[PDB]
From a paper:
The Ras superfamily of small GTPases are guanine‐nucleotide dependent molecular switches involved in the regulation of numerous cellular processes. The Arf proteins, with 30 members, are also regulators of intracellular trafficking. GEFs catalyze the dissociation of GDP, allowing GTP to bind instead, and thus produce the active form of the GTPase. The Rho and Arf GTPases each have two distinct GEF families, Dbl‐homology (DH) and Dock homology region (DHR) and Sec7 and Sec12, respectively.
Binding of GTP converts the complex back into a low‐affinity state and eventually the GEF is released, generating the active form of the GTPase. Several interfacial inhibitors have been developed for the Arf/ArfGEF complexes.
Author numbering:
A (entry chain B): 12 to 38, 45 to 128, 132 to 177
B (entry chain A): 398 to 659, 666 to 698, 704 to 743
Write the structure that this text describes.
Amino acid sequence: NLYFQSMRILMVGLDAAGKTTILYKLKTIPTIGFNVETVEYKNISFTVWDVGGQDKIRPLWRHYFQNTQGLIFVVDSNDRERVNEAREELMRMLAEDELRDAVLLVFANKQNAMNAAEITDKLGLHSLRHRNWYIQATCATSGDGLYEGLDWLSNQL
Amino acid sequence: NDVVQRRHYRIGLNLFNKKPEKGIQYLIERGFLSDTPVGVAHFILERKGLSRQMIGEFLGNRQKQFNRDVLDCVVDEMDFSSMDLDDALRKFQSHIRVQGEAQKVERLIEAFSQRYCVCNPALVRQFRNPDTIFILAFAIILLNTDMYSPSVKAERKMKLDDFIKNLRGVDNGEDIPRDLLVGIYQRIQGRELRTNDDHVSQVQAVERMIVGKKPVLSLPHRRLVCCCQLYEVPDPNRPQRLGLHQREVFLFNDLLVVTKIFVTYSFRQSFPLVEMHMQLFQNSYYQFGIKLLSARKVLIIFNAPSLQDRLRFTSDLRESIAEVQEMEKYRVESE
C-alpha cells in the first residue's frame, strides 16, 4: 500500500437502515444537501456519498457513477417488512451500466433480526453473476463490523 | 408558578430537539400547542429554540401521515411566486435544515417543488413535464453539496458543463433551456445554500473557541444559557492568590463546561446537572463562594469575581438544574 489513493464510494439503502449512523462512525456544519464524508483507511481516502431517490431522480446520480469504485448497501436486518423493497433499492442501483464494475459491500445492520444467509437470499445477492460482493454483519451503534467490511472493501480496491 | 410554566415550555422544546414527535405530543398535552398539522406548522416556522436540523428530521419523514401533512402546511406558508427555482429553494431551506440522507432530502424537495408549481403555474406549464421542476430542484441542492462539500476535492467538483450535461433530456427527452441552468449554476456558485441560525449555532460557536480535545457539545437539544468567569477553589479553608485558577465557565441547559484561557479556551471538565446540588458560602478567604455537589460529593468549588456575577450565574444554574430534574421525571415515566 505504497501510494495514497483517492476513491469514491456510494452508500445506498432505505431510510432508517442506518446509513447516517454508519457514515458518522467512519469519518463542522455539514454542507446543505446530501451526506458526503471522507473515510481514510490504510492510506486510502474514501469520499462516501449518500445516494437515493425515486426513479425519475436516479439518473441525476449518473454523473457520479463514472468515478465510482465501491458501493456500500446498508439494510436493516430487523425490518423484514421492508426487506423486499430494500432488494428493489439495491437492484435498481445495480442496473446502472456505469456501475457494472463497482464492488459491493453489504452492511447487515442491527444484528429477531435476519441473519446473513436470510439477508443474502432475500436481497438476491447470489443472483449477481459478475459482481464482487460481500455481506458483513454489523451493529451501527456499537461500531461492530464496520472496519471488517472496510477491510474487505479496501483489499478489493 | 409563572417560572414553572416557562420551564415546562422549555422542556417541550428540549423533547422536540431529541425526538420531535415526543415534543409535539408534550407541548400539546401541556396546552402550549394546537394539535392540528397547521398549528404545528406555524409553531415550527415561528417559535425560537427549535433545532432546524430536527425540524428537518421531523418534516422529512416519508412514512408518517401527520409529519407529511405538517410539511405540506409548512410549504403552504411560503410564497415562491415569481422566484427563480434556486432562489425559492434557498428561501425554503433557510427555514428547514435540508441536509441528510438522500431519502430525507427527497421528501423535503418534493413538498417544496409541489408548492413552487402552485406558485408559478404559467412558467411550470412551459415544460413538457412538470416533473422537471422537482428533478431540477433536486439537482440544485445536489450542485450545492458537490460545490461546497469539503469532502469533494476541487478537481472532482462538477463544472458548469458537467451540470448542464447531467440534465440533458430531462424534459420528456428535451433539454431545459441552457441559458437557465447557467443562471442557476452561477448563482449557487456565488452564494452557498445556508440555513438560518438557531440555538445550536451559539453552542457551535463555543465549540470553536475551545481548541484541543473536547466533548461533542452542539447536540440539537443543548442550548447555551450563561458565560461566566469564576475562580476554581481547591481548598475553601485556605486562601489562594488574587485571581488564581481563573476559569471560563459555560452553562448550558443540561451541562456545565469548565475551561481556562489557552481568545481560546482549553477544555478542563464537564458536569451533568442530574443529581447536582448547589450551595453558596462565604468565609474569610472567599466572599462569593459557590460549591457544587452531587447526590454528598463535592464536584468543584468556585469564587465569583463579584456577588452580581455569583447572583447571575447561580440563578441560571439553579434553573437549569430544576429544568434537568423535570427531564428526568418525564424520561422515566416513559412506560
